[PDB]
Design a protein that fits this description.
Ribonucleotide Reductase, subunit A, oxidoreductase, 320 residues, homodimer, mainly alpha, ribonucleotide reductase, binds fe (iii) ion
Chain lengths: 320, 320
């Protein structure tokens, strides 16, 4: 079991050089005059100060009209499904990041995760503002609760939980790597059917207010992916005993599964009824994301057939 | 034992009205369209958006000079002791607030605590910036590590930990109320010898840069005290079985002890060698704070002899 560190360890190492992501021997004073993990402190500053944003300073005068009239029945169904799921995801994230933060022994990394946890809270605030602004009170509740109706949404949610619940029940080193990899996958993939969709509506001038909110959320998710990419790669070097062949295998499995499921969710939401998104065009996106993120944490591409981002336009569109 | 909630509960209550601070039955989706605890959501917005601040946007060109020359040997000793302790406190806070947040079943309250945890991270950043700006690299390390030299500081730290460690080891309902009350006390009292001191130097135009940083930190601590005052009072109404006479007694004890110790720390730091602070004038401050905060959580004044703030000038000086 990963023994959760005492609030203060007077027998703790003074040398910042002796810090470890996990299983270190810190004082648990945030001795930030010496930083071992420069990327953790930089990412704290970027998430906490540089990229700071206020969801209510984004004006939402247009979208309530476009929803009521201009949007098709299929476009409203998607909007509902995507926002319901992203509300689920960010909710799981604010809660699970408290688990990671309390197990990590490097103060600069703990700081980066506190900043991440806060950004996840701002997202929860952004979605509440989107629904308060765009739709009516009953519809807003319905969207928050759309897992209660839709089995493909409910199962999406129970699945993401299960992997996080393994670590909470059995807080061992194996279930920590799993939970960490799951966090990276959730941040890597599970936002991007949703992001691609909203950026599609925005390409033809639909829900450009919601899309503004999304650009800010998506800027945050890149930093989060960047934070956990560094954490996984640093855990490789510092704890190679934990990356057994059984784990190295399991990582490739879940990543392939996750790419598969995100694609299908992308298809169940759109269904070729959205002017810009094809059931095929979803694949080449999620497949390119999978390769990008799994190779970035030191693996072989899991879909070598794909070696090009189909939606390259996004990278310029998403920008602020 | 307070069973830490699963990541997702499909058997969770839909009705925001059924939420509890602890031992509720939530879905753990942040259903923020309905808010039971209006004060929690307001405080989130105030801490997260309204009161947002960047420590590095405060200029620190003056204090490095005033430290090197203008400051007495006693004034430098105090500066060192106070900052070392506040670094300890805010470090304990970022870590312990992850414990509270993961045990609380009301999403709006969990949100407020995430915002609090983030503000605690910004304080850790502020102190690192103060020491990077004001003093030299060896002195900066020495101040971070001044518990290693000074037994009155080391014991101050081990004591605050012990009460938080009780709950982490034995996460039962009794040790939760204790930890919660300890958090309120730490936020109520333990900052204010430090704040009074810095605001004293600032009254005679000493370390006005450090004092700017402190005003922002102190604005945050008022919201934190306000957040946990509401949490304790809501816990009284919702869980009166937990406020046994044994607990109601223990609360009055620790609060009197805490007022006593903060006063002494105030005296060990200053020692009547600081132009504005008397060993007596410390008492009437901490005694007035004690009464203010313990009555605000529904108790009888613990020092009826005192019924006036000696340093009323602070309330206008601390303002931004
Ligand atoms: Fe995220
Ligand atoms: Fe605080």
């Amino acid at each position: 079991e990963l023994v959760r560190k005492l609030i203060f360890n007077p027998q703790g190492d003074r040398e910042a050089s002796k810090r470890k992501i996990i299983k270190g021997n810190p004082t648990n004073i945030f001795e930030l005059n010496e930083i071992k993990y420069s990327w953790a402190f930089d990412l704290y500053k970027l998430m906490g100060f540089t990229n700071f944003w206020i969801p209510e300073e984004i004006q939402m005068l247009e979208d309530r009209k476009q929803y009521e009239t201009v949007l098709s029945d299929y476009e409203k169904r998607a909007y509902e499904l995507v926002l319901s799921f992203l509300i689920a995801l960010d909710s799981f994230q604010v809660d699970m990041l408290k688990e990671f933060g309390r197990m990590i022994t490097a103060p600069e990394v703990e700081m980066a995760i506190t900043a991440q946890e806060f950004q996840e809270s701002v997202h929860a605030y952004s979605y509440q503002f989107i629904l308060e602004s765009v739709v009516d009170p009953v519809k807003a509740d319905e969207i928050y609760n759309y897992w209660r109706e839709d089995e493909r949404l409910l199962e999406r949610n129970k699945v993401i939980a299960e992997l996080y619940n393994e670590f909470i029940r059995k807080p061992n080193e194996e279930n920590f790597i799993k939970a960490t990899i799951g966090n990276y996958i959730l941040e890597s993939l599970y936002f991007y059917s949703g992001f691609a969709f909203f950026y599609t509506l925005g390409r033809q001038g639909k829900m450009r207010n919601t899309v503004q909110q999304i650009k800010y959320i998506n800027r945050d998710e890149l930093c989060h992916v960047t934070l956990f990419r560094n954490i996984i790669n640093t855990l490789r070097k510092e704890n190679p005993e934990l990356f057994t062949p059984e784990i190295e295998k399991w990582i490739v499995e879940y990543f392939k599964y996750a790419v598969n499921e995100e694609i299908k969710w992308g298809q169940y939401v759109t269904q070729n009824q959205i002017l810009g998104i094809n059931d095929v065009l979803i694949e080449r996106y999620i497949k390119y994301l999978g390769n990008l993120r799994i190779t970035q944490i030191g693996f072989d591409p899991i879909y070598p057939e794909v070696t090009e981002n189909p939606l390259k336009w996004i990278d310029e569109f998403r920008k602020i």
